[PDB]
Amino acid sequence: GSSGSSGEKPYGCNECGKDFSSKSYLIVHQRIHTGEKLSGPSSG
Ligand SMILES: [Zn+2]
């Protein structure tokens, strides 16, 4: 006996290992990662 699907925090971040209760909260977070261009003073 159950009303219906009881999904909870189905989304997560593998990059770091976080968990969000919404696809948005995640997509917004994952951002903190991306944005790392190669062009830099420490090429090697
Ligand atoms: Zn992350």
Swiss-Prot record:
Involved in the regulation of antiviral interferon signaling. During viral infection, recruits SETD4 to TBK1, leading to TBK1 monomethylation, which is critical for the assembly of TBK1 complex and IRF3 signaling. Belongs to the krueppel C2H2-type zinc-finger protein family. This is Zinc finger protein 268. Overexpressed in ovarian cancer tissues compared to normal ovarian tissues. Isoform 1 and isoform 2 are expressed in squamous epithelium tissues. Isoform 2 is overexpressed in squamous cervical cancer (at protein level). Expressed in blood cells. Isoform 1 is expressed in pancreas, lung, skeletal muscle, heart, placenta, liver, kidney and brain. Isoform 2 expressed in chronic lymphocytic leukemia (CLL) and several tumor cell lines. Isoform 3 is expressed in several tumor cells. Isoform 5 is expressed in fetal liver and several tumor cells. It is found in: Cytoplasm. The chain holds residues 301 to 331 of 947 of the full protein. Interacts (via the KRAB domain) with TRIM28 (via the RBCC domain); the interaction increases ZNF268 nuclear localization activity. Isoform 2 interacts with CHUK and IKBKB; the interaction is further increased in a TNF-alpha-dependent manner. Forms a ternary complex with TBK1 and SETD4; the interaction between SETD4 and TBK1 is ZNF268-dependent and leads to TBK1 monomethylation. The KRAB domain functions to reinforce the nuclear localization of isoform 1 in addition to its transcription repression activity. A zinc finger (C2H2-type) spans 11-33. It comes from Homo sapiens. It comes from the Eukaryota. Induction: Down-regulated during erythroid differentiation by GATA1. Down-regulated by HTLV-1 Tax through the CREB/ATF pathway. Up-regulated by the regulator of nonsense transcript UPF1. Up-regulated by the cyclic AMP-dependent transcription factor ATF4.
